[PDB]
Amino acid sequence: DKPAQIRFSNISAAKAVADAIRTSLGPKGMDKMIQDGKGDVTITNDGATILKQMQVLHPAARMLVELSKAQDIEAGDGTTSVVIIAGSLLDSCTKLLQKGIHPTIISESFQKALEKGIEILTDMSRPVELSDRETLLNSATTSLNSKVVSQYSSLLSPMSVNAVMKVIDPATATSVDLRDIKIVKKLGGTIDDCELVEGLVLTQKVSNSGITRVEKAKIGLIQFCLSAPKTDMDNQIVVSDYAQMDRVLREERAYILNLVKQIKKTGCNVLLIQKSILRDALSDLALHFLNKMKIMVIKDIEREDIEFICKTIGTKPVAHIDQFTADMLGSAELAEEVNLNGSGKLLKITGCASPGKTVTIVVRGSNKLVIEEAERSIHDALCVIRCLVKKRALIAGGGAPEIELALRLTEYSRTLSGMESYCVRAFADAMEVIPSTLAENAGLNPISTVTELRNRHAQGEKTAGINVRKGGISNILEELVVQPLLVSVSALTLATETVRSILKIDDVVNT
């Protein structure tokens, strides 16, 4: 009674989210207006930008948002395919619980279906070897030509290949770190000037008297006090004159040189500026003195840059002056401020020693939206190439994996025994919504299209899918649309994980 009712309600909420998102799938896509508290409009063809700003009440909606976020952070694209698989599996679950079979068997059967489906997708895919630049560029162009970012991904794809080659030798199958390869902007500019920056791009400096460039830069990681503390007020006594506060002013003028002499025995060249809530103070009257004898201040550093610079140049994190020893110092090859193709004060660090070969790409553009679209293009390019390199053997897309996987999973349910057999059959014959969604968004009769795909996968080619850029079922064109095999692996595994978790969930309780 109550457990069945609450599971039905959870399934209904998840299916409502999924079917509201179903229309916006794939490169073709169709948008909605978001039901929000401000009343604005959205023309966002994608699916992620709905869940990421969805007013969610039911915990099923929240868990589907976590599903989409996990899929995006894992591999990027497919963020709508995952949620639509989830919704279809929950619809199959609605049917199965309508017949009354128990949720735990549903979870176990879906786990078996997941394992066999991963085996199937690994089987039929093309075992492309990713070891050299020609293979990398082939994978990159196959990944970029199938999306709408092709126009500008062309110039940046070889550079992203260079970056991922810097990170590791592709013979090492370990995944590259998406966060390690940071993306930065230099304000304005052209498009071609977006260039690789080995080392790191750093924030803008203040240039009272500090040098613009230095060979063999001795970068120091500074987080400690600057002055005699102006602890609580600008004046401690009658405000006729600063009779006693002159002491702390000249103590600033003395402690600045005291710390600079404490630095020069180590040789800190640059200064990352932490905010004034951590620092005692920051002002030109002391920053000039630090600058003139080779301590350049760089504005408003943040924790991500601190972690990145620690990972790169080996400077240990610092919270006090006494650790000014060489542990907080790094010795690069060269550090320069470069302003080509439009002036820009962002500092660069070059050729420093690093355990991990962190690399960044600077992004340029005549408009801010162009810069950010280039950033998201390079972001998804790194996502797809990383999920390929860590798993190899990319797969053709366009519902072809769903058709082939549903067919072999239906026959697997045929040969499988026990209660789980019909569960796996329902999983397979409901999972086919993705090609049905492509057919709906392509204008073809969805059911007839799904039947045609299933028939063509039978007794014939298994890579045949629905073509989104020419039209309809196609087999002759191999490059219909291709995604790394990890895209489908993550989709199926996260979808089944969340579905079987939903099945495991019972009797929602307020604290």
């Binding site: 079979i101 128990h102 949720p103 735990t104 068997i105 176990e108 209660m419």
Partner: protein
């Protein structure tokens, strides 16, 4: 002999319901499993148990799935005393 024989049978049924819930949470046929277990170790065969890993009768002597004596005795006594405490109150009043 006493009328508490019905209460004793009720206790036996309630304790029997625990492996029934074990089977139900695992999706197996609860009634069939518990009845066949009752038969399996009511005709002697004291070591017979319910193998939840496949949902079949399992001779627990060789499967090795065992539970420490102290936790079973503690849960038995604690459930008994808690049920007594909850049962023996008939009416409640509040401030």
């Amino acid at each position: 002999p006493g009328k508490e024989a019905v209460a004793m049978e009720s206790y036996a049924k309630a304790l029997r319901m625990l492996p029934t819930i074990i089977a139900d949470n695992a999706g197996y046929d609860s009634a069939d499993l518990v009845a066949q277990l009752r038969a399996a170790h009511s005709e002697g065969n004291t070591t017979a148990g319910l193998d939840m890993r496949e949902g079949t009768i399992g001779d627990m002597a060789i499967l090795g799935i065992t539970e420490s004596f102290q936790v079973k005795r503690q849960v038995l006594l604690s459930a008994a005393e808690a049920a007594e405490v909850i049962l023996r109150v008939d009416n409640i009043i509040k401030a």
